[PDB]
């Protein structure tokens, strides 16, 4: 049955270390049982019985105090049978990552945090740690990944994020990661407010 469930993450897919995140499988299709599968360092499948509200079948899976094994690509399967466990098509993937495992990076704005409309803004992620890649986040829920430049004479590993001509303003944060552990990120950079006047 190629009817896929939907997978959400409350509060968000970026969960700090040793904190709890609620992964919700919901669908207009009536499902009596739900299966949550993770791909990563430690692959596991979780089951929760389905709850029925209005015409929506939903289950709030609980991913406990965040640790390395609980991070990865999550896909939710659906079922109405239990002993057969006839599995639906996989949900659209959701990458749950753990933050706060490394030192925070430094986020800077050139020309500056506050800028006039139409003026190009470029945000720079820098850290003395050897982060192989940096992640830019606006309002918490965002994903812009660029590879990082290596050891500068300054000793900083840096990546430049071109925001382009400025029409919107938001609160941007930076995260650092290593290529070996893709779903394990660093502490958030000190938030940088981009304002367009």
């Amino acid at each position, epitope marked *: 049955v190629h009817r896929k469930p939907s997978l959400l993450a409350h509060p968000g897919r970026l969960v700090k270390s040793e904190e*709890t995140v609620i992964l919700q499988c919901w669908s207009d299709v009536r499902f009596e049982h739900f*299966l949550l*599968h*993770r791909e990563g*360092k*430690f*692959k*596991d*499948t*979780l*089951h929760l019985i389905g709850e029925h509200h209005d015409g929506v079948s939903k289950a709030n899976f*609980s*991913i*406990g*105090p965040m*640790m*390395q*094994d*609980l991070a990865g690509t999550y896909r939710c399967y659906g079922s109405v049978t239990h*002993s057969p*466990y006839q*599995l639906s098509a996989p949900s659209d993937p959701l990458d749950i990552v753990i933050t706060g495992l490394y030192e925070k990076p430094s986020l800077s704005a050139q020309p500056g945090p506050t800028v006039l409309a139409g003026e190009s803004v470029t945000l720079s992620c820098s850290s003395r740690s050897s982060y192989d890649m940096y992640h830019l986040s606006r309002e918490g829920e965002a994903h812009e990944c660029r590879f990082s430049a290596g050891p500068k004479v300054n000793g900083t590993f840096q990546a430049d994020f071109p925001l382009g001509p400025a029409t919107h303003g938001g609160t941007y944060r930076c995260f650092g990661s290593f290529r070996d552990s893709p779903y394990e990120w660093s502490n958030s950079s000190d938030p940088l407010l981009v304002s367009v006047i």
Partner: antibody
Amino acid sequence: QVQLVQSGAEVKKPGSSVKVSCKASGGTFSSFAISWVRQAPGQGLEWMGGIIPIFGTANYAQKFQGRVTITADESTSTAYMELSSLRSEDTAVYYCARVSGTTGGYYYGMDVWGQGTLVTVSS
Amino acid sequence: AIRMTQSPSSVSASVGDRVTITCRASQGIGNWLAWYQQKPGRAPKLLISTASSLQSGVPSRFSGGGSGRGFTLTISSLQLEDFATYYCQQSYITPWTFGQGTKVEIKV
């Protein structure tokens, strides 16, 4: 009452391949997460890897990866573990066990164990 | 990756003396430590989960304590059925590692 039975003892020459079975009763095989633990003569207990509950994919340990393949057959309600290249260090008692989990995606230990299987390299 | 250091390696004990076994973790594992008992020939048996929670059918003399990186297993009054090798195992992160084991032996 979940119970696990294992294959018999095996005497194999160096470089051979051994396969051990783990038959489960008392519950649905799909619900179980079966891991494999090795007890060497001098060494203690080492987690080699285990199957994921429903799908049957196996998490492995780096030390044993490349020579160990862990599989499962839902029809037989049996889990399998295969050592590719047998060396004198591989000689040990190999156990299968069910890992029990609680809330939050955590597992807390191996509550049910098999009787163990003795593999022995050539003297 | 997480290394478990178990001490002591061996205990020469008689029936009735308190035996304390310690297990130190390389990094913080929270309360996610399990204590096992393996008698000769038979398979390991789970005695305590979540550092302190005892399984059913386990006598009250077995007690588990600790959190973070330091853990202890205390048998207040040893009995003849309690002479075996004891292991600690972490369940926090995928490379699940056991301790080297504590061999509680009958005193010569």
